[PDB]
């Protein structure tokens, strides 16, 4: 009637200088034995919740310095946005790009990005200009119609060269 | 006739778009832009949506973590790049003291913190690692807990 749970309770947890204590194997690094101070607040208290938990996934944050304009050039030049397209401080997720899309006699590269309850279109037109179109789902508009709206105006710009 | 006039007529008049701008293929910055407003709030800047000065932003990656490995990595490499993870809680790696002399025996002991608490890790010979938690809400602190951890560590070190 003496285990590890008893020994750490007597020589380490009894001082009430620790919240709990465990023993981890130098091999794998996982705790085989542990105690904690609980059961006074809640009888249904698992003290393994503190020392053990199976392999799960977590997010790691890095900081990168963004040039908003470059996020647009990289989309047409390279064909991706690893961090999304940034415009006016808002993050849009790069979804689709359709290269050499033919609309009424003219070719267009057109990209589509999404935000929460909205999104944007980017349309490369010749003469060296890019058309930017925003849409907002809260205003009963959508990407399909806004893309059509973008394409209709684009042809007009496309006529001037 | 300006740009804001031309896009208001050919694009926002369609009320299928929320706003529109055009970016030069050179720098990629919008020189001209329009948006739809004047109904809720008259005093709004329509550039807030299209332009913004070079700033810094956060990028998220996903990692699959094994908590045991996060304890080993502290001793093997000497810091914890992702913090030390135990029982689902992230502790921020602060200090590691190698070959600390406590009453005749040497110890490698690391200290980690979370909000209002923390933990100590002590490698003792014979191949065990001692893990000690402390909670500031229970009037405990890192120093006293390290001493308690260190003194108990001494006992296991004797049994080897």
Strands (E), chain B: 19-24, 30-35, 55-65, 84-86, 89-102, 105-114, 117-124, 128-135
Contact assignment for A12 to B149 by CB distance below 8 Å:
yes
CA angle B111, B113, B117 (to 5 degrees): 115
Give B-chain residues touching A35 at CB under 8 angstroms. Answer: none
Q: Which of B26, B29, B145 sits opposite A17 (nearest CB)?
A: B145
Residue A68 near residue A87 (C-beta atoms within 8 A) = yes
Residues 6+ apart with CB under 8 A from B51: A68, A88, B29, B30, B33
Rounded Cα distance between A153 and B29, Å, is: 20
Helix axes A143-159, B3-10, angle to 10 degrees: 130
Distances (CA, A) of B126 to A3, A26, B111, B123: 19, 9, 21, 9
3-state helix, strand, coil split of chain B in percent (to 5) is: 25, 40, 35
- What are residue A122's DSSP bridge partners? A111, A132
Is A137 strand, coil or helix? helix
Contact assignment for B23 to A145 by CB distance below 8 Å:
no
Rounded Cα distance between B77 and B79, Å, is: 6
With the CA atoms of B92, B95, B100 and B103 taken in that order, what torsion angle do they form, in degrees rounded to the nearest 10? -60
Phi, psi of A77 (to 5 degrees): -70, -40
Contact assignment for A59 to B57 by CB distance below 8 Å:
no
Rounded Cα distance between B89 and A132, Å, is: 44
Instruction: Identify the domain containing residue B13 by its residue range.
Output: 1-160
User: Which sign does the torsion angle of CA A95, A100, A102, A107 carry?
Assistant: positive
Rounded Cα distance between B71 and B94, Å, is: 13
Where is A99: in which H helix or E strand? strand A90-103
> CATH number, domain at A67?
3.30.450.30
Give B-chain residues touching A47 at CB under 8 angstroms. Answer: none
Contact assignment for B25 to A153 by CB distance below 8 Å:
no
Q: Which of A53, A56, A128 sits opposite B25 (nearest CB)?
A: A128
Q: Please, which residues 97-116 of chain A have a Cβ atom closer than 8 Å to chain B?
A: none
> How many H helices and E strands in chain A?
4, 8
Q: Determination technique for this PDB entry? A: X-ray
Our count of domains for chain B comes to: 1
User: Which sign does the torsion angle of CA A147, A152, A153, A157 carry?
Assistant: positive
Give the minimum alpha-carbon distance from B15 to chain A in angstroms, rounded to a whole number.
8
DSSP B87-102: TTEEEEEEEEEEEEEE
Residues 6+ apart with CB under 8 A from A6: none
Data resolution in angstroms = 3.3
A67 in contact with B at a CB cutoff of 8 Å?
yes
CA angle A16, A18, A23 (to 5 degrees): 125
């Amino acid at each position: 009637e003496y285990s590890w749970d008893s020994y750490l309770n007597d020589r380490l947890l009894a001082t009430n200088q620790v919240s709990g204590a465990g023993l981890a194997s130098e091999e794998d690094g996982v705790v085989y034995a542990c105690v904690a101070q609980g059961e006074e607040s809640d009888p249904n208290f698992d003290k393994w919740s503190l020392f053990y938990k199976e392999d799960y996934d977590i997010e790691v944050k890095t900081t990168k310095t963004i040039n908003e304009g470059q996020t647009i050039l990289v989309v047409f030049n390279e064909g991706y946005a690893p961090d999304g397209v940034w415009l006016g401080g808002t993050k849009y997720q790069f979804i689709n790009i359709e290269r050499d899309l033919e609309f009424e006699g003219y070719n267009f590269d057109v990209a589509t990005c999404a935000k929460l309850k909205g999104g944007l279109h980017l349309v490369k037109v010749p003469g060296g200009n890019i058309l930017v179109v925003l849409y907002d789902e809260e205003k009963e508009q959508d990407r399909g119609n806004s893309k059509i709206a973008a394409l209709t105006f684009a042809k007009e710009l496309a006529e001037s060269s």
